[PDB]
Each structure stands twice: as structure tokens, then as C-alpha cells.
């Protein structure tokens with residue numbers, strides 16, 4: 336019942352910001368641009384130093400013309416409107432946002448520990464207690480997001496950053512959407528798509544719980560439950576309704592994953608009468624103190640190396656691209672609310 | 674092994690979202 340009351344106040348705070356979003360809270364020359372931390376189809380994320388405070392931030396830069404060509408206008412508006420309104424310990428904080436003639440900018444907290452992706456690939460796989468620690472944070476985050484009628488739709492290790500306390504920060508809200516009914520957009524990452532997305536059905540927040548199953552599997556096995564050289568081959572595996580588990584998976588882990596990687600929506604955990612509690616009370620989580628996880632009181636399985644402020648040694652190197660801003664405003668009407 | 678198959682595959686790097 337206290338979770339219920341906690342979520343009620345969270346929704347009151349969210350809706351205030353959802354209905355009156357922050358806008359134009361900094362400008363580009365408030366920052367020095369240091370180094371690219373990551374890229375994507377839209378767009379790139381740069382380490383920046385805020386001149387007036389000396390704080391470092393991670394600045395996502397989107398080219399408005401590219402956003403238009405990729406038909407991501409509404410998604411980009413979703414991303415910023417949602418990110419500026421949410422507030423949860425495991426969600427990266429949006430500190431500033433603004434736009435200029437050419438680009439959109441979202442300035443987020445810099446999370447120096449690197450992507451979970453990097454650590455997972457290097458180490459091979461996480462122990463089940465390690466994976467469970469991370470998984471518990473995603474469970475709580477989706478409980479929070481779903482209570483706000485938000486679907487996240489892009490869970491993967493690439494989007495989970497490890498902070499200096501060893502806890503997760505979720506990044507990349509590019510496909511997040513506030514929706515009370517079903518929705519239909521084919522989006523996500525191939526390995527993580529639920530069957531109902533691939534099959535062009537209307538779908539709902541249950542796709543995030545499927546994606547959680549993929550994430551737990553990949554953390555504990557070191558590889559995804561459905562992988563191939565091409566996405567079409569991955570989709571055929573996803574919709575087949577068959578999953579194979581490594582022999583070192585515990586019985587409890589396999590049982591949890593069978594209920595998350597469940598094609599049948601009337602049986603998939605997270606989606607049933609008991610909601611998230613079917614997950615929180617599962618035997619695999621028996622050792623998890625959910626309040627202590629939320630409070631960040633649990634000892635983390637590992638603390639990323641910290642070589643100082645502004646150091647990026649936990650991130651890959653990327654080819655550096657200039658930030659060109661045209662003398663003419665592009666796509667002004669499309670992004671007027673950004 | 675399944676691990677060896679994954680490691681030899683073309684999708685062990687960062688995965689892009691579908692658009």
C-alpha cells in the first residue's frame with residue numbers, strides 16, 4: 336500500500352511537469368565540448384563542461400533535418416517532454432535542453448562508469464546475484480514509468496549506464512511514449528522486441544516486461560536468448576515460442592524467464608492481475624530488499640574505475656564530428672514545442 | 674558452444690534501434 340501511495344505523489348509531480356514542460360534552459364556556448372561518448376541514428380552524445388559551474392554533462396545532439404528524414408519528430412518531442420518530467424533514482428536526469436537553427440540539445444547528467452554493455456561484453460557474463468541487482472533496479476523503474484502511463488520501448492545494456500555508486504542510470508528515451516491504450520509503432524532493438532511488436536499487433540507496456548526478460552537472460556548468459564546475423568532471422572526465433580537456457584542457469588532464473596519471455600499475454604509476468612508483484616515476489620528475487628535497492632543502500636557488485644572528473648576511460652572512442660549550426664533556422668514549426 | 678556462436682556473429686557490438 337505504501338508503493339501505491341508513493342506512486343500517487345510521483346504522478347502528481349510528473350503531471351505538473353508533463354503539462355508545463357521546461358524549455359530553453361541553456362544555450363550552446365554555456366558549454367565546452369570535450370569528447371563524443373556515444374552515437375546512434377539520432378544522434379550523438381558528447382561529454383561537455385558547463386562553464387559557469389565546472390560540472391560535466393552528457394549532451395545529446397540531434398540534427399533536426401535528420402530527425403525529420405527518419406520520421407522521428409513526434410518521438411523526439413516525446414523523448415524530451417517525458418525526460419524533463421520524470422524523477423526516479425535510476426533514470427538519468429535531464430539538466431538542460433535547448434535548440435538552435437540546426438540542432439536539438441538535451442544536456443543530461445554525466446554518468447562516468449560507462450554502459451553496462453561495455454562491462455558485460457568484456458567480462459562475458461554477470462553472476463546471477465550481479466544480474467539480479469541490476470534487474471531489480473529495472474523492475475522498480477518500469478513500475479515507476481508504467482504507473483505514469485509511460486512505455487519505455489528500448490531496454491538494452493547499451494542504454495544502461497553505471498554510476499559511481501555502481502547503480503544503473505537508464506538513458507535514451509527516444510522511443511518512450513505516454514499512452515493509455517495500445518500503440519502500434521514498430522520500434523525498439525531487434526534482440527529485445529516482443530512477439531506482438533514483430534507481428535504488427537497493437538501492444539502495451541507488456542513489451543517492456545518481455546524486454547526485461549531478454550535483458551536478464553543476456554546479463555546472466557552473456558548472449559541474448561534470440562540472436563542471429565540478421566534481424567529477420569532474430570524475429571523468426573522470437574516468434575517461434577522457443578527459448579534455450581544455459582546449463583548454469585538456476586531453476587529459479589529459468590522459471591522467471593519463462594514467465595517474462597512468454598508469448599501469451601494472458602500469462603506474461605508484469606501484465607497479470609498482480610501486476611509487478613508477480614515479478615517482485617518471484618523466488619529468483621527472494622533475496623532482494625526492494626526498499627533498500629530504491630534507497631541505494633545495497634552494496635553494488637562492482638564500482639567503475641574513476642580516474643577523475645571528465646575522464647572517459649569507461650567509454651569507447653568515436654570519430655569526432657563538428658557541430659555545424661546553419662545561419663538559417665531549420666524545421667522551426669516541427670520542433671516549436673522543444 | 675552457443676557462446677562461441679554468439680562471439681563469432683556480427684551482432685556482438687552496440688546494436689542500433691530499428692527505425
Ligand SMILES: NS(=O)(=O)c1cccc2cnccc12
Pocket residue numbers: 372373374380393395427443444445446447450493496506507
Ligand atoms: N551512452 S551514451 O554515451 O550514449 C549517453 C547517453 C545519454 C546520457 C549519458 C550520460 N553519461 C554518459 C553517457 C551517456
